Design a protein around this ligand. Structure first.
Ligand SMILES: Cc1ncc(C[n+]2csc(CCOP(=O)(O)OP(=O)(O)O)c2C)c(N)n1
Ligand SMILES: Cc1ncc(C[n+]2csc(CCOP(=O)(O)OP(=O)(O)O)c2C)c(N)n1
Ligand SMILES: [Ca+2]
Ligand SMILES: [Ca+2]
Lengths: 806, 806
């Protein structure tokens, strides 16, 4: 679970010391200098004679506009941390404020600790400035390469979901969450403000949202800075916050008055938070209004007010670089030089180029430093789950009655397994869902926990399984669920969320950003320890969406996740749960895995159970497997056709087609694919099937009929250099469907058992089986006409049991 | 459970009709006339010529002062009931307003229905007037003889506890609870206002408290009518009420404006109650402010303003009779005659003496009438409990190991039994306790229900087993617990409360009033059906009160309840639970009994189990029994002494004395008394032991040593004419004790095993056993000196097991 770090929720009981404020003001100057040096300078960091245009980088990359505001806030937060011993993680929402994050880590000493070549002297400072956003250096954003980041904030709008995920079951953790005022215009951010209705001030930590109201986004004003101050305050009060406003930099107030004013307001806010935390030790049934800070400052604060007659400080014109080419004109170089000198670096750095002791003597030390807090490197906190014994949940009836027995709902099995994970791993495992946990049949967890709800309660007739604390969280937002879980994992804990398949697409871009985090971490950031995997139960899938119908039918999550499978990163798992015993085997592998995004595509409809758990574990280790109990070919040369399937509904239709083929005497081989990346090119993926293993399973030369759960294009693209790939005939979802019966869903997508039987006969000999083929095609129209007439599927479809069942 | 009666919680959605108000005004006139006729007249009810002083009763009994106010309220409540079809029971707090209750029942027709000689004509009216508070007639109060009463209100202060008990698990029931403003000065009433924190507006009914603020009690003003109106309103608002005030009769407003004003205010109050009930169908988690009515009217309203120069209307002088002897003076007779004529009875009664149709055409009909509502005759609602099978709870180990086995806490057994009663009888069985349910070990009921709590919730760390509805109610008030339960029983349901023994005395006077209700019901009121018994678990008794010590040691409940055992009423049960199996047998008998007060004196300390359930049921049927398995005499003539005991600690000491006597060779007989009234004179009590049964058990002539749980005076008084009673030697509590060890409690009261052994030897031969007697007395001082030295009782005391244990 989360470590208790420091002395949390302590009031100061004194004014902020004038010396600490002189610390904060020097911090802001030197962090601003070091932010500018990283953007503009390739050499001569301390502007020794001669400082000329040759010291300027040839291409200016990075963002000034948000940066001096972030440096201000970070300076004051560091003072706060050292004075109070508070366990603190910052969410840097305007993540293009990269130079502030790297400057912080350089000043707190964690940068040189982590990156020993970047020393705390003039040659290390030169390397520090050159490397920023440079070929072979470090990124422009607050990337996972930076000590202290858990959030790159490249794609905007997840700051608050990540902040609130971080503090769940983390009652000593304080998260100051800096939100762009442009970022507050996004969808995901806008709903993220309501997360305070889903956290509990006793059992969870505290988020302080900080609205970086600098007035501007890239080229536009921001909505929230142009509405009235009364509207802006009512807005935050309507969302359960008590808003505090700070305004600075729009007049000629000296910088030391600003710092005193801010430290006074910070400590007032903090006294309000400590009151909330102290009250919650007794009463955590009544939701407080949490503080939030509206930080109103000019964009690009302390850049030159006018460059070439255009307003730059307090404008969108300061967003990227205020000064656009200091290398090309003497005039513009002089502006850069005077700007760099306005921070007076002669007082900040000593003769050797180290930042002076009195600049940083207010800073926190040890694990309380922003770049050294374990919650910001949450792999160091994370332990293996205590997992229950997987055979306790095995469907034993396959071994009793035969492969293909029963009408179980496979996700109920996962639900019972996850219930006992939650029971064995209190405060360490969570379930998230967008109001779909019961619907996706995971509600056995309510026997051991509750849905965390901190809005109002009204009646025990409606409010079953809800409590102000609990390990299940539901809000109708895929962005919230994915974002909560992502930060729960990045801070060292574990969990799962579930979703209807077609709505996974809502968070495709969040999955992309989590995968780029993971890809960069496993390629090049070894000091960042492995975090628990992002586990996604994909249920209510396309084949059993014949009640919501056509516009809820999109299995396309698989195509998205296949674009993050390169360079042997192995950050993606794509798993088709064939039945409940395969779902168990998959779930245990995903629950033991680290540094991944695991998609688990499982049906929740009643379906057969095909495998025992020991067979499921064997198929899962390779990824695909022949089912010799289902083949009537007895090796690869007497097979006429290979019937392969990936997914529970393709498996059902292929197994029903193999029974009709067997009745015709045909010699075939049956294959199941549980793990989709096992089919990936053996050159590209060293966990995938070797080409010899692939040709034993599939064959060297026989026609393979392949029923696939998602778009056939996924498979055709993956097997492009596999042996015998020209003989594959992939059937997937093909954008057909309506609100209809289950048979009609498989029929219109050409994956029903009769079409698959017919396709196998056309592949074997379309001419000797011509009579029987015309017979199967006529039944397809007749079983559809039965559904229209009677209101339910034809009994030859619905009553079918595999012949292996005794 | 409670019947749903009528159309509850319906708004009127129209003004009160002017015709109904003329009904109410005629009701008030005729009820006032009939109230005065009952007090003053023995003949000539309609004052036919000649109406003289001979028609006046020789002795004036009864109360005028509260009556015209009650008649006003009752008239308006009857109009309300007929207009809304509301299920309604009235609690008449000023129960000395008897004539209002009898007048109501006479006007609603239920009186003549119930009492066929009191007809609705002039001769029935004559009998109606003469019988009131007259030799061989009916009582002065709102007695159980009156249709519509569930509360005599003789002893004041239980109106609100009874009102709130009535509405528990009775969600269609409306209870207008009329509270005396003098009665509001009592202890029990003052805490009764807080009961609205213990009821739930969805699962329970609604009480409307009506403060009958007439300004005066017997001879004094009332506190609540002499404080400021701002204080009086703040007071009721502080207790969770929304107070409404009505003021009338202190000016010359005509009576029809008063009725319109009142009906408008009544319907506003009722619209507020219907809103509460409608809201509670959705949100019953948030406690509403319930309405209450402050009814401010002159005491004795419509009596002559001045009699003999003394203010009478609006004074305490109208409390009993305004006019003190209308039979002795022509002047005072004329005052009575003009008073009777002011109601203008010529318009109220027709030529035959029936009340005219237009007086009563507004009245409710059927079961909605006050005197016909089944909640006011709750024996008609009551069914037998579904009781679980008693052998499921039997301590089986007596039969395995021997009599005297174990260290069980007997009340835990009752707790498990009562849990499954509650489970089988939902909404029909309640437990009450004054914050003592867990302490008296009855907390197995929390496995199936909750403590009903409707004040604020703060935290799951403190608020375990609480819910806004549930079948256990706790408030630290014996008056509330006894009063809640009493009305739950009178409205047809069942239950139990428990108490520490010494605090039963707190409600001695409530037990007295319930017993007088029951005594009058079983003697003479056959139309009033049997109600479930008042069951009281008396635990933490005097012998195991050596931790609270001396001032918590009072077993005297038994002496109080022995004063209500006359004339074969059988309304009292006094039971000593010898062990857990006897407690089961007792509890089942009490749970099946009707029309009783059952005291069940049971220990909750670890103690031996003496009897099997089949033996316990045999002893319980007779009440006392010989224990032939424990005697060493083999009939009555070879016994030298009879060792009798009543109660678990006397049984333990007598069984330990019998083992030491056996070791000496003595021939004795052991008797246990489970039911105290079995010893009562066989002439007085036809359920008690016959004199021949008594002398078989006790003997004709042997010394009986009798260890009794409570004061020896109880037993000595009961056996005064029994055979061999001069040979009894009763040992009870004798007002000795301190905070001490359990042995020291029995030692200082001369009931410990060593003193009892010694007393038996003095009774047999004090001279041949003189050595061993001096030995036992010296050990008593030595086992006390051990406790002082070591801090716990001597091992010969604590480690003793009966020799019957294998
Ligand atoms: C989802 C998304 N769309 C577009 C962008 C491009 N972008 C980067 S910075 C930026 C402006 C950000 O504004 P604010 O949130 O206002 O940042 P700050 O001013 O503090 O620089 C935008 C639109 C983005 N990062 N994310
Ligand atoms: C416990 C108790 N003590 C004393 C009395 C005697 N008593 C009877 S009526 C009465 C006055 C009652 O006053 P209120 O409650 O003011 O009645 P109302 O005016 O309506 O007649 C008193 C003191 C009583 N009935 N109960
Ligand atoms: Ca901005
Ligand atoms: Ca009064």
């Amino acid at each position: 679970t989360s470590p208790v770090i420091g002395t949390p929720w302590k009031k100061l009981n004194a004014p902020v010391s004038e010396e600490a404020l002189e610390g904060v003001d020097k911090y802001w100057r030197v962090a601003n200098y070091l932010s500018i040096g990283q953007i503009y300078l390739r050499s001569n960091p301390l502007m020794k004679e001669p400082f000329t245009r040759e010291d300027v980088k040839h291409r200016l990359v990075g963002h000034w506009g948000t940066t001096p505001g972030l440096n201000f806030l970070i300076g004051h937060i560091n003072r706060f941390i050292a004075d109070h011993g508070q366990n603190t993680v910052i969410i840097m929402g305007p993540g293009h404020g990269g130079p502030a994050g790297t400057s912080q880590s350089y000043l707190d000493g964690t940068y040189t600790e982590t990156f020993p070549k970047i020393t705390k002297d003039e040659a290390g400072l030169q390397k520090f400035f050159r490397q920023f956003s440079y070929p072979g250096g470090i990124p422009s954003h607050f990337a996972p390469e930076t000590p202290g980041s858990i959030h790159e904030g490249g794609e905007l709008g997840y700051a608050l979901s990540h902040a609130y995920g971080a503090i769940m079951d983390n009652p000593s953790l304080f998260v100051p969450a800096i939100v762009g005022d442009g970022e507050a215009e996004t969808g995901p951010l806008a709903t993220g403000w309501q997360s305070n209705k889903l956290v509990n001030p006793r059992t969870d930590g505290i988020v302080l949202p900080i609205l970086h109201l600098n007035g501007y986004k890239i080229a536009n004003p921001t909505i929230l800075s142009r509405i009235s101050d009364e509207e802006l305050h009512e807005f935050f009060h309507g969302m359960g916050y008590e808003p505090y406003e700070f305004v600075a930099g729009f007049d000629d107030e000296d910088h030391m008055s600003i710092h005193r004013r801010f430290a006074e307001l910070w400590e007032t806010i903090w006294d309000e938070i400590c009151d909330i935390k102290a009250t919650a030790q007794t009463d955590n049934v009544h939701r407080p209004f949490y503080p939030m800070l509206i930080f109103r400052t000019p964009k690009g604060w302390t850049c030159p007010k006018y460059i070439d007659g255009k307003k730059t400080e307090g404008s969108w014109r300061s967003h990227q670089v205020p000064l656009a080419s200091a290398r090309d004109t003497e005039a513009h170089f002089e502006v850069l030089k005077n700007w760099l000198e306005s921070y007076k670096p002669e007082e900040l750095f000593d003769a050797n180029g180290a930042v002076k002791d009195d600049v940083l003597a207010f800073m926190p030390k040890g694990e309380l430093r922003i770049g050294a807090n374990p919650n910001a490197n949450g792999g160091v906190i994370r332990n293996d789950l205590k997992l229950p014994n997987l055979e306790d949940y095995e469907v034993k009836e396959v071994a009793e009655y035969g492969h293909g027995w029963g009408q179980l709902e496979a996700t109920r099995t996962l639900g019972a397994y996850t219930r006992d994970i939650i029971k064995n791993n209190p405060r360490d495992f969570r379930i998230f869902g967008p109001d779909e946990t019961a619907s996706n049949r995971l509600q056995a967890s309510y026997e051991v926990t509750n849905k965390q709800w901190d809005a109002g309660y009204i009646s025990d007739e409606v409010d079953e399984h809800m409590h102000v604390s609990g390990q299940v969280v539901e809000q109708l937002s895929e962005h919230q669920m994915e974002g909560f879980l992502e930060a729960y994992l990045l801070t060292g804990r574990h969990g799962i969320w579930s979703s209807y398949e077609s709505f996974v697409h809502v968070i495709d871009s969040m999955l992309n950003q989590h995968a780029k985090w993971l890809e960069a971490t496993v390629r090049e950031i070894p000091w960042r320890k492995p975090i628990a995997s992002m586990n996604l139960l994909v249920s209510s899938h396309v084949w059993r969406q014949d009640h919501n119908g056509f516009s809820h039918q999109d299995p396309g999550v698989t195509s998205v996740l296949l674009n993050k499978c390169f360079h042997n990163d192995h950050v993606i798992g794509i798993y088709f749960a064939t039945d409940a015993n395969m779902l168990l085997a998959i779930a245990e592998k995903c629950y033991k895995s680290t540094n991944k995004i695991n998609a688990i595509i499982a049906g929740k409809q009643p379906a057969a159970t095909w495998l025992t758990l020991d067979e499921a574990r064997a198929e899962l280790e390779k990824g695909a497997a022949a089912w010799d109990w289902a083949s009537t070919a007895k090796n690869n040369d007497e097979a006429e056709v290979v019937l392969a399937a990936a997914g529970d509904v393709p498996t059902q239709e292929i197994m029903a087609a193999s029974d009709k083929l067997k009745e015709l005497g045909v010699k075939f081989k049956v294959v199941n694919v549980a793990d989709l990346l096992s089919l990936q090119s053996a050159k590209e993926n060293d966990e995938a099937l070797t080409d010899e293993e692939f040709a034993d399973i599939f064959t060297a030369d026989k026609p393979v009929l392949f029923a696939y759960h998602s778009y056939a294009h996924d498979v055709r693209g993956l097997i492009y250099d596999r042996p015998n790939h020209d003989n594959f005939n992939v059937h997937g979802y093909e954008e057909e469907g309506s609100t209809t019966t289950p048979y009609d869903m498989v029929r219109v997508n050409r994956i029903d058992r009769y079409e698959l039987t017919a396709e196998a006969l056309r592949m074997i000999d379309a001419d000797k089986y011509a009579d029987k083929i015309d017979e199967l095609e006529k039944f397809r129209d007749e079983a559809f006409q039965f559904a229209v007439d009677n209101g339910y599927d034809h009994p030859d479809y619905t009553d079918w049991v595999y012949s292996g069942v005794n």
